[PDB]
């Protein structure tokens, strides 16, 4: 089982500093070079830096825009690589992925799940969660319910329905940034034979503020 797991991202002050970590397992880490690639709406996938293995002198390479500000390093005893970012600018906001390049040639073979870095002086704010229940009687065959997750910062938030039991009829929409705050909608569509008979609850978690809210959708 090959895995790469990034951590350390989140909201960070412009001009501030933040260190991302990437823990590896399931492949010969010592035989691999490791890279950081980030993704932003403006540039798409953008290579950020690379650090080679011991045999190749742990050499480092950086993309121009971050040279002198970022430092990639690695700890072979912990099978991990780090990206120390300083003098953070708005252009550094994005999802950062750790990816490994085994030297038995395979390009960027393994990728982590990514960590979102948001460069902003705005404050962390928890969301308000509101249930969205239909106005008239349902019938017909199916009914669509929703949850409005409003007023939070920064991203991400995770939304599930009935703690994960309801997922096939779910649509959680990308969050929309308004006045320094995100607003997101999530909808779930179930048989009219399921709701209001059975309890349907949207579970919202906002890691950044350690907020967790369960709201039941009640017929109005």
């Amino acid at each position: 089982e090959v895995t790469l797991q990034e951590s350390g991202g989140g909201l960070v002050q412009p001009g501030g500093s933040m260190k991302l970590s990437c823990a590896a397992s399931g492949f010969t880490f010592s035989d691999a070079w490791v890279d950081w690639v980030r993704q932003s709406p403006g540039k798409g996938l953008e290579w950020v830096a690379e650090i080679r293995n011991k045999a190749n002198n742990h050499a480092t390479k950086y993309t121009e825009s971050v040279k002198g500000r970022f430092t990639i390093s690695r700890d072979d005893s912990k099978s991990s690589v780090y990206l120390q970012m300083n003098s953070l600018r708005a252009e550094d906001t994005g999802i950062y992925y750790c990816t490994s390049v085994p030297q038995l040639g395979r390009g960027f073979a393994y990728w982590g799940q990514g960590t979102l870095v948001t460069v902003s002086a705005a404050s962390t704010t928890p969301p308000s969660v509101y249930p969205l229940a239909p106005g008239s009687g349902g019938a017909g065959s199916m009914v669509t319910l929703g949850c409005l997750v409003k007023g939070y910062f920064p991203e991400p938030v995770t939304v599930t329905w009935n703690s994960g039991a309801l997922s096939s009829g779910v649509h959680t929409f990308p969050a929309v940034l308004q006045s320094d705050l995100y607003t997101l909608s999530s909808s779930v569509t179930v048989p009219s034979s399921t709701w209001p008979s059975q309890t349907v609850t949207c579970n919202v978690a906002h890691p950044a503020s350690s907020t967790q809210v369960d709201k039941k959708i009640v017929p109005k």
């Binding site: 996938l45 690379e50 040639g105």
Partner: protein, 218 residues
Amino acid sequence: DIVMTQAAPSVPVTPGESVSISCRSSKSLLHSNGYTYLHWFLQRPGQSPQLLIYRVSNLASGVPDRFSGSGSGTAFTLRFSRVEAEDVGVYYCMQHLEYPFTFGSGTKLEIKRADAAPTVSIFPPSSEQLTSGGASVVCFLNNFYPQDITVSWKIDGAERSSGVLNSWTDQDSSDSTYSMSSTLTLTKDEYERHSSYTCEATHKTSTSPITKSFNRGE
């Protein structure tokens, strides 16, 4: 810097048919050692990128047999022998020959399917939100095809445009439909000066707008 170009920003395809995506580099990607360092990646909606083909034509492990790659020097092709609805996503080529490594802008594979009218649902502000002084009216336009749709908000007949937050999902990997969320945000006070709230959707499936509305005083 080597420039990687993927001309098509997207390509429509019917499940079951063959398709190909192209990419070109501003420089030959052949290395001194005889290898051509060009790779293809897949990024499914909301997931991290994943390797599909390394060095022009070698499939990575776990990658389905339907993928293949070809090309030399500066022109490359990724081909699907039979596309599946599950293939929705953005496909990227990348040069791994010189620093800085660079990626093409990507080509989104769009699955073609039968037209489908959206299921429109409108939601009055929740009681909980009103006691807090807010009044967001939400409209979901779900599971439609094709992807383009227009939403117009009407407060007592008069159209509203400011304070509208719109969000769209990527194409569904199981049924190939699209969905959209539109939220009209008002202050509770603004909300109580009017009575009829309307979510109007125009989609190719209907000659006339699909209207859903409710009354504040009901």
